[PDB]
Amino acid sequence: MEAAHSKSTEECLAYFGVSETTGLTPDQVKRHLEKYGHNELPAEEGKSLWELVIEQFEDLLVRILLLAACISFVLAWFEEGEETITAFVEPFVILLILIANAIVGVWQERNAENAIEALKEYEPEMGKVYRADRKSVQRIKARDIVPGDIVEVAVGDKVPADIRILSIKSTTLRVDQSILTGESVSVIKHTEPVPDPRAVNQDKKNMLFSGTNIAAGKALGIVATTGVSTEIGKIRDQMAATEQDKTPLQQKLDEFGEQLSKVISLICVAVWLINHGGSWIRGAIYYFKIAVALAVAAIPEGLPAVITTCLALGTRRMAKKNAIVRSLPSVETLGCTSVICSDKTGTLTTNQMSVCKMFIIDKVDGDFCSLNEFSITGSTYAPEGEVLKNDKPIRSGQFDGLVELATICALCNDSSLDFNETKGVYEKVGEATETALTTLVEKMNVFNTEVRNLSKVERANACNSVIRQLMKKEFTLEFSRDRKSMSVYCSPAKSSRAAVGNKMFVKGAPEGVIDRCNYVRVGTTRVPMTGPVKEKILSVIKEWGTGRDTLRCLALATRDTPPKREEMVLDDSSRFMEYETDLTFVGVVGMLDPPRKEVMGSIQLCRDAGIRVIMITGDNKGTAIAICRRIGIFGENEEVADRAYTGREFDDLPLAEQREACRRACCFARVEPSHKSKIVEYLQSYDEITAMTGDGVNDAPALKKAEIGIAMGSGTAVAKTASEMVLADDNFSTIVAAVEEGRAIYNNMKQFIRYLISSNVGEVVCIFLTAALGLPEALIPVQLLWVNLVTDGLPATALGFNPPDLDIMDRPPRSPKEPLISGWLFFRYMAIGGYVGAATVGAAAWWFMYAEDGPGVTYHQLTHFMQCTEDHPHEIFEAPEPMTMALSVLVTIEMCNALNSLSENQSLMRMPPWVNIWLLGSICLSMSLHFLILYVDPLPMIFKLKALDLTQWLMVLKISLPVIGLDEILKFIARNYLEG
Numbered sequence: 016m017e018a019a020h021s022k023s024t025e026e027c028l029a030y031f032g033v034s035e036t037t038g039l040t041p042d043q044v045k046r047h048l049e050k051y052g053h054n055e056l057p058a059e060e061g062k063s064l065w066e067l068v069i070e071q072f073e074d075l076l077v078r079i080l081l082l083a084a085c086i087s088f089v090l091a092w093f094e095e096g097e098e099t100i101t102a103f104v105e106p107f108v109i110l111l112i113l114i115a116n117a118i119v120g121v122w123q124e125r126n127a128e129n130a131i132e133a134l135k136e137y138e139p140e141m142g143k144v145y146r147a148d149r150k151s152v153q154r155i156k157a158r159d160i161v162p163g164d165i166v167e168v169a170v171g172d173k174v175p176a177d178i179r180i181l182s183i184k185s186t187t188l189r190v191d192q193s194i195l196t197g198e199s200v201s202v203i204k205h206t207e208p209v210p211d212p213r214a215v216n217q218d219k220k221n222m223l224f225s226g227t228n229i230a231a232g233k234a235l236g237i238v239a240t241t242g243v244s245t246e247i248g249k250i251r252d253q254m255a256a257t258e259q260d261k262t263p264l265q266q267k268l269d270e271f272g273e274q275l276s277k278v279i280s281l282i283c284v285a286v287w288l289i290n291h292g293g294s295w296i297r298g299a300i301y302y303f304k305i306a307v308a309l310a311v312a313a314i315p316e317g318l319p320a321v322i323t324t325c326l327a328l329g330t331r332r333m334a335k336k337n338a339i340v341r342s343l344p345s346v347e348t349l350g351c352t353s354v355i356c357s358d359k360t361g362t363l364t365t366n367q368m369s370v371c372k373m374f375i376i377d378k379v380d381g382d383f384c385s386l387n388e389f390s391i392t393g394s395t396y397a398p399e400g401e402v403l404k405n406d407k408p409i410r411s412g413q414f415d416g417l418v419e420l421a422t423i424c425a426l427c428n429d430s431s432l433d434f435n436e437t438k439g440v441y442e443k444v445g446e447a448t449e450t451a452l453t454t455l456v457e458k459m460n461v462f463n464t465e466v467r468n469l470s471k472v473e474r475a476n477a478c479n480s481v482i483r484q485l486m487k488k489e490f491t492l493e494f495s496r497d498r499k500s501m502s503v504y505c506s507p508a509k510s511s512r513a514a515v516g517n518k519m520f521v522k523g524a525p526e527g528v529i530d531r532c533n534y535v536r537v538g539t540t541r542v543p544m545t546g547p548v549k550e551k552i553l554s555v556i557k558e559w560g561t562g563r564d565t566l567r568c569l570a571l572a573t574r575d576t577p578p579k580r581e582e583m584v585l586d587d588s589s590r591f592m593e594y595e596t597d598l599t600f601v602g603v604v605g606m607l608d609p610p611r612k613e614v615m616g617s618i619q620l621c622r623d624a625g626i627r628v629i630m631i632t633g634d635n636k637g638t639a640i641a642i643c644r645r646i647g648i649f650g651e652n653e654e655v656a657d658r659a660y661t662g663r664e665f666d667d668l669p670l671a672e673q674r675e676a677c678r679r680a681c682c683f684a685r686v687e688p689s690h691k692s693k694i695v696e697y698l699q700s701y702d703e704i705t706a707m708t709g710d711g712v713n714d715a716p717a718l719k720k721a722e723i724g725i726a727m728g729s730g731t732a733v734a735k736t737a738s739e740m741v742l743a744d745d746n747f748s749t750i751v752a753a754v755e756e757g758r759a760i761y762n763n764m765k766q767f768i769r770y771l772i773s774s775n776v777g778e779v780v781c782i783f784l785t786a787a788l789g790l791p792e793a794l795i796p797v798q799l800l801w802v803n804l805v806t807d808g809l810p811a812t813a814l815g816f817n818p819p820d821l822d823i824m825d826r827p828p829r830s831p832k833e834p835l836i837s838g839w840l841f842f843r844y845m846a847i848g849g850y851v852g853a854a855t856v857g858a859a860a861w862w863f864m865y866a867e868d869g870p871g872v873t874y875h876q877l878t879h880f881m882q883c884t885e886d887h888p889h890e891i892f893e894a895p896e897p898m899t900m901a902l903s904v905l906v907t908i909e910m911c912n913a914l915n916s917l918s919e920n921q922s923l924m925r926m927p928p929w930v931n932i933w934l935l936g937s938i939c940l941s942m943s944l945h946f947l948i949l950y951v952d953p954l955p956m957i958f959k960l961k962a963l964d965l966t967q968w969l970m971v972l973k974i975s976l977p978v979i980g981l982d983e984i985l986k987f988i989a990r991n992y993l994e995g
């Protein structure tokens with residue numbers, strides 16, 4: 016049953032043909048369970064680190080490296096004999112690596128818990144129903160409860176399903192829908208039908224939401240809906256249907272993979288395009304060495320390990336700045352953040368609400384309507400502060416009107432203060448807005464109660480108490496979005512001066528309350544409310560709220576002559592506004608919820624960063640805007656008409672203009688959680704990367720949709736699980752900082768990503784020469800693997816600690832359509848790639864040509880024959896020394912190219928190699944490995960190498976170093992004829 020809240024208590028039984036006294040017949044429980052299914056959320060879809068591993072190997076490149084491992088096998092020989100121990104490394108090193116590379120995409124690439132699985136921590140196990148086949152309250156497995164059957168909930172219970180309340184047996188009933196909202200304070204319930212068929216949950220006050228807890232009382236009701244069709248069940252169904260897109264990195268790395276696998280099979284047919292006795296088998300085998308060589312030459316097998324290292328090093332780095340980044344990759348996307356929608360309370364502001372202005376009527380004579388208005392001092396909840404009129408401390412109790420102001424402030428209040436012994440400071444107890452009222456009536460001290468001889472704890476609620484002595488609070492009428500007010504019934508006590516009438520003390524939002532006052536209290540007298548009076552009262556409320564004060568105002572009125580105690584139906588919340596009528600305006604208090612000292616700047620920082628900030632709120636559109644200026648969302652005087660909207664305004668627009676309003680929008684007032692999703696959606700229909708804050712399962716669906724969901728340290732459990740980042744301190748600037756860090760982590764990433772790739776293009780062009788010109792392969796797999804995993808590995812990682820630009824936040828957000836290699840940068844790495852493909856080929860065969868200790872046969876047609884079937888023009892071709900000439904050339908150029916990476920366009924002149932202290936330190940450790948694998952004998956025998964002579968080390972530095980020169984030329988040109 017969908018619109019239960021709106022049907023009568025009798026209409027709900029009539030719909031399920033059930034008796035409140037008896038309950039569901041055991042037959043009905045059968046038909047129903049068949050019609051509506053079980054009261055559960057769909058079971059997990061399932062995962063596992065075996066099919067997760069198998070999901071890595073289907074990728075194109077990890078299919079090629081695995082193909083090369085198949086060929087590395089079909090090249091050696093057959094099944095067992097004896098030993099030439101040495102051999103099977105090339106096929107075992109790759110398969111070793113692949114397992115250790117797939118695995119790194121899991122147990123440090125968290126892909127486990129989802130906010131949808133979290134929603135199985137608020138669906139209960141047991142629930143108490145009254146069916147026909149007993150007489151007692153049979154407690155059953157929640158999973159078997161069904162739409163229609165009667166249910167019992169009592170204090171402490173988790174509500175099992177969505178339930179239209181039938182009768183409240185206890186005095187009152189108090190639910191705790193914190194899970195949904197997040198606002199600790201419980202809510203009163205009733206049984207009258209909420210007649211509006213499309214009422215929001217906040218207005219469904221005769222309903223219990225499966226997942227919620229009864230925080231007091233005890234009631235019975237009929238199950239309206241279960242399983243996926245409850246309100247919490249429907250949030251689950253929204254997050255279920257969310258297509259989670261990959262990051263801008265994971266996406267252009269994916270089309271890099273496709274381009275790389277396509278280029279390999281393009282060269283493996285291009286080598287073919289350029290290409291006595293025996294048989295057909297050695298010919299086939301040959302081309303299969305260069306294919307495998309080409310395989311390892313273009314794949315940067317290091318990348319993953321390097322990336323992960325940077326990400327895991329960034330996580331710990333943002334955690335120090337209070338930003339808890341959960342999803343690993345989120346650190347790169349954190350850099351492209353285009354827009355930020357934040358909540359106001361608690362993020363932009365400090366939720367330390369305090370009163371600091373207030374007024375009552377002074378005198379009214381015809382048109383004369385004068386106001387008597389004071390100011391209060393003190394930001395904290397501490398009773399420490401003073402009241403000043405005309406900017407000069409006055410004694411609050413000397414003004415009759417101020418007495419009433421504080422009377423209502425204390426009696427129409429459901430909160431309090433408490434002194435904390437540990438922290439040594441006061442604590443709020445209840446609602447921040449109300450507690451501020453409680454602190455006010457203290458500061459005021461309208462009766463001059465001795466309060467300086469009390470102690471911290473005793474004085475906190477001192478004056479309040481003295482006032483709770485004067486009047487007795489019988490019952491009270493809860494606030495409701497509907498009438499926007501609340502009131503308490505009060506009666507006299509001891510030798511006072513009240514009689515013939517009790518009093519209702521109303522306290523709500525200004526517009527509402529005032530429109531319900533026919534009388535004004537001027538002192539202790541009273542006079543009829545008039546236009547000129549009302550217009551004053553409003554004029555100032557508007558001033559304070561939409562001023563540079565940005566105050567939230569409360570009207571305070573009393574019903575002097577209230578209805579008889581036996582005249583109000585206290586269980587009909589709809590009639591609460593009627594009882595709150597014929598009121599008398601007493602005065603207005605206005606309070607502040609200060610914006611974080613930090614945020615002002617943080618906001619400016621986003622201005623220069625080119626990132627948009629949207630503020631969601633609860634303040635009225637007027638004060639919503641007024642806070643926006645004061646934090647700098649808008650200029651102090653500029654236009655904003657079509658820039659800020661309210662809940663209903665935005666709903667009154669058709670989709671086209673809603674979508675439109677979203678790229679120019681900056682502020683939303685009085686919104687439903689339902690909008691946050693619509694807004695995220697819209698923002699994306701503009702290819703905008705969106706950071707979005709929220710808490711409560713209510714906002715879980717939007718924290719999933721937003722590229723960056725953000726929760727709060729103090730936030731609800733589920734809300735966190737829904738987000739990708741959590742502010743451990745709740746600060747708005749904690750977002751801003753993380754976005755800059757993400758900006759710096761990606762900038763440094765773009766570098767080492769191109770570095771490790773730069774090598775691969777050179778490694779290939781090298782093996783393309785040793786095949787196109789038919790020489791002996793200057794470099795083999797097992798060597799390259801070491802270079803790409805370790806040799807370039809340490810420098811590439813150390814390139815992640817580069818100093819970030821000083822204008823890093825002074826440039827607009829980087830697009831997701833930005834390619835990491837494009838323009839002049841393509842020609843700069845096809846030169847560097849076309850230079851290494853020659854330098855590793857030059858200096859190596861140079862050992863076959865111009866060498867001293869090696870067989871120097873200049874132009875000995877190494878191209879003509881590597882068959883030696885003839886031996887007419889004349890195993891040293893399989894010598895270790897020449898391979899050691901190519902390898903040492905690579906390794907050294909790499910370390911040079913590492914230095915050529917520290918910046919994109921700054922000369923090594925302008926950008927000194929000794930800025931990145933950890934890039935130098937890495938090169939040092941990179942070379943001490945190149946030497947290690949040459950004279951710790953097991954190694955150079957395995958790599959097929961042998962230590963070069965001191966004359967064989969200078970040739971390298973003659974043919975290597977000149978790259979730093981070729982590079983600089985490209986830097987100062989893209990600097991001076993490619994700018995404008």
Ligand SMILES: Nc1ncnc2c1ncn2[C@@H]1O[C@H](COP(=O)(O)OP(=O)(O)O)[C@@H](O)[C@H]1O
Nearest residue numbers: 198358359360496631632633634662685686687
């Ligand atoms: N959709 C709405 N319609 C009317 N009043 C609302 C609505 N949403 C919120 N409010 C009121 O505005 C107040 C301020 O809300 P906000 O500034 O977002 O902080 P919070 O929502 O955490 O209270 C809320 O306490 C609530 O009383």
Ligand SMILES: CC(=O)C1=C(O)N2[C@H](C1=O)[C@H]1c3c[nH]c4cccc(c34)C[C@H]1C2(C)C
Nearest residue numbers: 071076077113116117120272315316318319
């Ligand atoms: C088995 C396993 O998990 C994996 C791997 O073993 N890898 C990556 C990979 O995902 C490969 C890869 C996919 N896409 C790209 C782009 C650029 C570079 C690489 C890759 C390297 C590949 C490798 C071998 C590191």
Ligand SMILES: [Mg+2]
Nearest residue numbers: 358359360361
């Ligand atoms: Mg909030």
